[PDB]
Design a binder for this molecule. Structure first.
Ligand code: NI
Lengths: 108, 108
């Protein structure tokens, strides 16, 4: 419970206005068709995004902090796998992952 | 098996000379007494380091890639939790974590 509240706080921070300049690509599931990324679902077999993490937290799906962290990290991994490493979206993922990792490390 | 070989390859890369300039603090368990860090084990309840990850891989302890990644990430989290964020060791952890995350994302 306490560890999951820490996770929920992190989630709320990742969704907050403070980080929006680099968090916004991760707010919703990638709409591959809409973006013309017709290879997305051949490369990324387990899509993840912050709205899905939020649904899982609200539904009490996550049983521990490790499960939560694995999904947030999956989201970043998908970005690093799909996009060339010099693309702006990758720089955004790295910055948001920094925010996540530093606060996650302050695990009660 | 294939995913665990990918993990073992990553591990070997993290231990290789190519990354030694920033990987070396993570090679062995933190010797808190030797370094004068008498609060280390009060702050870090689950120490982790690359020699421990290697032992667990050689002993077939890891049953899947997620388990392996959780230990490598724990190692970095410990660094981010214990050290002020402007210390050189934190910069080293961030650089090694970049190496890890980008290659881990190329999960077969
Ligand atoms: Ni993890």
């Amino acid at each position: 419970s306490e560890q999951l509240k820490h996770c929920n706080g992190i989630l709320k921070e990742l969704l907050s206005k403070k980080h929006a300049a680099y968090a916004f690509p991760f707010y919703k599931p990638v709409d591959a068709s809409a973006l013309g990324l017709h290879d997305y679902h051949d490369i990324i077999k387990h899509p993840m995004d912050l709205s899905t993490v939020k649904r899982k937290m609200e539904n009490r799906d996550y049983r521990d902090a490790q499960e939560f962290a694995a999904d947030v990290r999956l989201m970043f991994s998908n970005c690093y796998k799909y996009n060339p490493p010099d693309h702006d979206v990758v720089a955004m993922a790295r910055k948001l992952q920094d925010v996540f990792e530093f606060r996650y490390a302050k695990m009660p």
